[PDB]
Amino acid sequence: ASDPQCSQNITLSSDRFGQPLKQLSVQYPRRQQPAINLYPDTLPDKLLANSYDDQQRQLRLTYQQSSWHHLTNNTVRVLGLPDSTRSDIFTYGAENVPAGGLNLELLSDKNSLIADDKPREYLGQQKTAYTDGQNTTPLQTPTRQALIAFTETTVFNQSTLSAFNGSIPSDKLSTTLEQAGYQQTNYLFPRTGEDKVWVAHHGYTDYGTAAQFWRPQKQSNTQLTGKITLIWDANYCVVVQTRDAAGLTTSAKYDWRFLTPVQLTDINDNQHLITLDALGRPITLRFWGTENGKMTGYSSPEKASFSPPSDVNAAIELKKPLPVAQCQVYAPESWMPVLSQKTFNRLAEQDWQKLYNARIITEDGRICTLAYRRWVQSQKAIPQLISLLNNGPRLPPHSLTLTTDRYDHDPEQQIRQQVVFSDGFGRLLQAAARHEAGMARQRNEDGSLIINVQHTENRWAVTGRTEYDNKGQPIRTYQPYFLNDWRYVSNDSARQEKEAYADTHVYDPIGREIKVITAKGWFRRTLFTPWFTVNEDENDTAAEVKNIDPKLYQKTPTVSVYDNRGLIIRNIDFHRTTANGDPDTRITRHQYDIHGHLNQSIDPRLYEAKQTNNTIKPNFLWQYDLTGNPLCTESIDAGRTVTLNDIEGRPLLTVTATGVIQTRQ
């Protein structure tokens, strides 16, 4: 009922095209301890007591400024081309939140927490370097095609230069940043008294001309990396033959019915090829190439021709010396019933056309559920056709993979067979692998599972079997087992055969799992509150069965306590050495800052020492750049390590806690 976490997004301003020129995101402070607790439930007393922190009570106002180009005239219009943005965080206390909270009119007030230009912590900015493709120099007015030369973002400023701390001479630092590719420039949305900041120029693209359609020709993460290219096909819609800075190339061919690449040549000129069927589905593969200059492989289709079965069982029956690997038999209609063709032909002689026209039976012998039901409801049905349909087996939509590992047609190794089932929601239901002869679960032809096992060559390891709630969550999952078949068995029998093992998943309305009920006879359980979550493990939950007396683990959940940004600031553990004693409440503490990077953390032992002796440092302290990179880590156990990466995201140098300075070429 009370103590909610609250968040509010406010547009401060927008242009004539509805673009959000000024924006604010607000994270409200936590309410103060009420006279009456609403959710002590079954919690340790300490969980409410220790749930309060300064980080839950700061008013966070994230402020953003931006602009877009809008190109207009009587014949050409382009709207919304962003070219700039700036972001900063302001922080205020509870005393800065008026009754009723914040809203736009208050925020637009001349004395507003933003409006009178109060201090704020800079987070970063971004700019888009637009081009007409004929220039490396950015346009100040992007063109109709809005082609982009690169994008510019901030990485460092004076607060992050500070972050390098000692052992990093400032001369070397500015020099290194230039070497690393950072440029030092102005703010897109400058403010009085501010200096220049370091930025990265990245995501570079060169473009072709209108005649080639406006397609990219070359690209790089940055100017510190190799520039790579590609070839456009004649119709400029297919990427052909990419080429590395190294001079390395690849190549590919497309299946023009699907405009989908089917053949690929790698940098060692090796071949990889897939076949597509009529619907564009991948059909096996072949590959070949040399080893130590010696040609091996499954070879090309004209030497290694292949026709996959449509019958999934025929595939199961294939032998070792095959020309291909990973053969794909798709039976998307395996769920569809089939009338035995012969019994049907017998009945079809008089009724085919009725069922054909009624769309009960399709031109390929499939039976429609609706049409069938309509015919039966109307009493135009024949009992013999009804039984034939009911007799027809049905398996969830299914496909089979046949993996081979032998080159050419040189046999030795038996073919790996995998079966995969999925439902009509596109969720996977189960899969199994073929194994060597041994004991396996029996089944009835009608799909009933039998828990008992008998020896067979047709042994499959069935795993991952899942039943779902039809909203989006699994509800029942099974332990792996061996089946004496490959075919799917019915869930009804799976559930009656209680000796089989599976877990049950209970969810709240959100989709969060609340309770894991297991085969073990125990469960996992959790509580969600606006400030913390509680995780009860099996020893704790096992207390409720009412081995080390569960009383020891009773009411000792792990609790994660969050700030008002959803970050974890405290972890509460409960230490008991005996069932008959009181817990030592052990709280690990975490402090986040600026961007939400963890600023520091400390264990409860050193923390209580810190409380009486200020000599104690957090177990860990961090400093970081504007993208959140951990430029420096300082530890009570490991000393201080500093690392500086270039635009690419890789170190040019690092300094160990022992002062070893390493650099990279």
Binding site: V78, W214, A278
Partner: protein
């Protein structure tokens, strides 16, 4: 722009009621041309002929031409002269009874089969003239100009079918709906590859089988002969029983 992209009064072509997309181009040069076919007497029943035989009423989307073989930022509508199939790489085609849908082989892009009239026929009058629609689309299908894409393909490749949707309709004459949809491809050797069909149902109606009677005891003494009127007053959405007395109204 062009007449095939318009809905207008048959007696006066200048009374255009509706303008239909004819062409589009993006800043990247990609562009699309939209070809429609006007309604006409195409296998009509004698009654259509006898009672309301107007022709170029409803326009139907026939073929959408996309995949620009040449680079240009010019809008393909140009001067209203329809482009050649050869100028485009891809085609979206709507079949209104032109060819068989139960072929083992794919259907042809170009045929001679006529459009077929449906039992379910209807018209609109809100534009001040009669706009007759005589049929529904039987199949949606997509084709690729394979040689433009590949270059080593036999010339008759312009029309390669890639994929089609079979549409089965409930032709009750009074009304019809789409009942089944199936996605089918074809192999180059004439094989049929499908995903199972999507089945749809609509609510049944048959007064012959479902008519039922109940006494309206609740409406006792209601009588249209006197001062009684059915009307949905105060709250509305369902008529109550109004009685207009001399100098007073009463209402149930």
């Amino acid at each position: 722009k062009s007449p095939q992209a318009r809905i207008s009064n048959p007696s006066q072509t200048t009374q255009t009621a509706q303008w239909l997309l004819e062409a589009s181009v993006s800043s990247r040069g990609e562009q699309i041309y939209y070809q429609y076919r006007a309604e006409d007497d195409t296998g009509c029943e004698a009654d259509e002929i006898t009672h309301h035989l107007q022709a170029t009423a409803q326009r139907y989307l026939h073929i959408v031409y996309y995949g620009n073989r040449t680079a240009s930022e010019t809008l393909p509508g140009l001067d209203g002269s329809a482009p050649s199939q050869a100028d485009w790489l891809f085609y979206l085609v709507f079949d209104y009874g032109e060819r068989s849908n139960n072929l083992k082989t794919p259907p042809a892009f170009s045929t001679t089969g006529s459009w077929l009239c449906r039992q379910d026929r209807f018209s609109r009058y809100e534009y001040g003239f009669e706009i007759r629609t005589r049929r529904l689309c039987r199949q949606v299908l997509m084709y690729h100009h394979l040689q433009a894409l590949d270059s080593k393909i036999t010339e008759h490749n312009g029309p390669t079918l890639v994929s089609r949707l079979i549409l089965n309709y409930d032709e009750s004459a009074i009304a019809s709906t789409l009942v089944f949809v199936r996605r089918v491809g074809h192999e180059q050797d004439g094989n049929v590859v499908t995903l199972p069909p999507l089945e749809l149902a609509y609510q049944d109606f048959s007064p012959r089988h479902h008519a039922h009677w109940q006494p309206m005891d609740v409406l006792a003494n209601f009588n249209a002969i006197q001062r009684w009127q059915l009307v949905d007053l105060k709250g509305e959405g369902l008529p109550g029983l109004l009685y207009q007395d001399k100098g007073a109204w009463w209402y149930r």
